[PDB]
Amino acid sequence: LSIPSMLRQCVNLHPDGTAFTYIDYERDSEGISESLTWSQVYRRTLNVAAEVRRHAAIGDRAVILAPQGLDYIVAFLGALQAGLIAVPLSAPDERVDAVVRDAKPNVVLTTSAISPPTVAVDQLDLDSPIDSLQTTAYLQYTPAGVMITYKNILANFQQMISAYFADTGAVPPLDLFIMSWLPFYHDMGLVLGVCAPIIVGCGAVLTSPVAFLQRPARWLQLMAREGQAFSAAPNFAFELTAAKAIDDDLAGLDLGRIKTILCGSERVHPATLKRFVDRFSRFNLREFAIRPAYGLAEATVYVATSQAGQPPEIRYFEPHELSAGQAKPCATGAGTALVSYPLPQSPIVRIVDPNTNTECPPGTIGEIWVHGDNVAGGYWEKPDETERTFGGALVAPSAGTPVGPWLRTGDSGFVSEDKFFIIGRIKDLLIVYGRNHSPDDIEATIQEITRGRCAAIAVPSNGVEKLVAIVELNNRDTERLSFVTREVTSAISTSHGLSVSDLVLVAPGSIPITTSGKVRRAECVKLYRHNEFTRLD
Ligand SMILES: CCCCCCCCCCCCCCCC(=O)OP(=O)(O)OC[C@H]1O[C@@H](n2cnc3c(N)ncnc32)[C@H](O)[C@@H]1O
């Protein structure tokens, strides 16, 4: 029923079984380990709940402001245990205090090392020998916090276990262990790192994303520990590992026991997936272990994924018609490549015209709408924004299609042969002469000339959008730069039929990224308009 009730059931069945293991690469370059059994985590969870009962009541919000690590886990788990609506955030910012005022928490859960009462859970006697809600568990973040219920989580996990383990009858192997470096304050990292261990019943090997960025090879190492690994990562993280990994760190590594590596949170590029398998197949990586996965925070986390026992399937479509709005399949190798996503059984996906609230015919591109019990009930204390995002109603629905409520994802997609495809985020698209061009395709054209980071943004000017590209380039003459500017400009002209209004050659690190690495094409637009970039001239 509730995460607290399942944790308590993990303690009954397997008191001394390992639950959470955190590898800390901060002091030692090769990492220091520490593990808790189900008994130890429950005990810390109970102790955090006691200190929280002293400051807040059932229904109050508890903001979690801690670095990655075991203390984050018992802070989050201690909140739900005391019947508080947890609020996972990142440790220090103005957009952190925007949440705090939107959520109005009655307690803050912090660490020594970093009006409402604040608790330092590290300084609490967490190993000292010795209620929950049943609807709203936590908010996932004008800032808008998604309301996630235990019914939301459980339903999504049931949809997940069924799709991810369809070839083994929705039963994961006895060997399974979760491995994640994803941050706990993000959709994927929190459900995979903190919740899945308890709901699934396996242990977790966890670390920080700054440790992965330092040395992306630790990801492969930790996955290859005893058992079958279940992990996840954004697309570019697959790139970063295929690039900056040394066969010396991978000395005598077995990757054949890996069970699932999810690729999600951003567009999945076939080019990136081929590099990953072509490079780590040497160490026995099974390619059907790579599972494209689509989702939103508004759906708890999961919407669709690739078939269980097969490697990712790739489809090909004519690029010219794609911009026109039409998906016309073409021969293998020709046109744009897109990862096929089988239309999910649960939740269900439909492609809808955002202007007429009516479904699109197959091959026609519209907005992705989602329906299912994993879809959240709305945004915390935001009635109007909840109506816009969650109040989707289908006009004259097709046979077998509910009329509502539908979650409007803001993503472009289409169906082709009972498979559906994700083009990209609508507001991030570039419209030029009625055609739609996606930044993921543009940057893929640049990212293969420069092999650095990019961002293809749309700057409005006197009634039209103009293509601007921020191109990170290595800093270590005034020619050579011309060869690159001229190279990329022509590569965008011939591959996309677009003119580059401005190419900003910046130093490495200039483009805004996340902690896991998603390029922030949103800020870039105003950093450009406010002339915040320094060019290599
Ligand atoms: C057995 C143990 C249990 C497993 C536990 C693991 C849990 C994680 C599994 C689900 C992974 C699903 C990605 C989560 C998206 C996210 O990270 O959540 P969120 O931050 O809300 O952003 C969402 C927005 O990102 C874009 N996006 C996301 N996936 C995209 C794609 N495959 N292709 C293209 N675009 C894509 C899209 O635009 C969307 O709207």
Numbering used by the authors: 4 to 95, 101 to 122, 138 to 153, 160 to 170, 177 to 511, 515 to 575
What text does the study give?
Additional catalytic steps are acylation at the 6- and 6′-positions of SL1278 with two multiple methyl-branched (hydroxy) phthioceranoic acids, most likely through membrane-associated Chp1 to produce fully elaborated SL-1. These multiple methyl-branched (hydroxy) phthioceranoic acids are synthesized by polyketide synthase 2 (Pks2) using an activated fatty acid starter unit provided by fatty acyl AMP ligase FadD23. FadD23 is one of the 34 fatty acid adenylating enzymes (FadDs) in M. tuberculosis. FAALs use a carboxylate substrate and ATP to form acyl-AMP. The full-length M. tb FadD23, containing a large N-terminal domain (1–460) and a small C-terminal domain (473–584), connect by flexible loops and an anti-parallel β-sheet (465–472), was obtained.
To gain insight into substrate recognition, as well as to provide a foundation for designing drugs against M. tuberculosis, our research identified the 2.68 Å crystal structure of M. tb FadD23 complexed with ATP and the 2.25 Å crystal structure with AMP-PNP. FadD23 catalyzed the hydrolysis of ATP and connected AMP with palmitic acid to generate a molecule of AMP-C16. We surmised that it is derived from the E. coli expression system and binds to M. tb FadD23. Therefore, we interpreted these two densities as palmitic acid and hexadecanoyl adenylate (AMP-C16); the statistics and final refinement results are shown in Table 1. The fatty acids or AMP-C16 were bound in the hydrophobic pocket of the N-terminal domain. The backbone oxygen of Ala328 and the -OH groups of Tyr376 formed two hydrogen bonds with N37 of adenosine. The NE2 group of His221 and the Nα of Ala332 were differentially bound to the monophosphate of AMP. The OD1 atom of Asp446 and O38 of the ribose group in adenosine formed a hydrogen bond. His221 is one residue that attached to the oxygen atom of α-phosphate both before and after AMP-C16 formation, gets closed (3.9 Å) to carboxyl group of the fatty acid. The structure of the ATP-FadD23 complex is similar to that of the AMP-PNP complex, with an RMSD of 0.2869 Å.
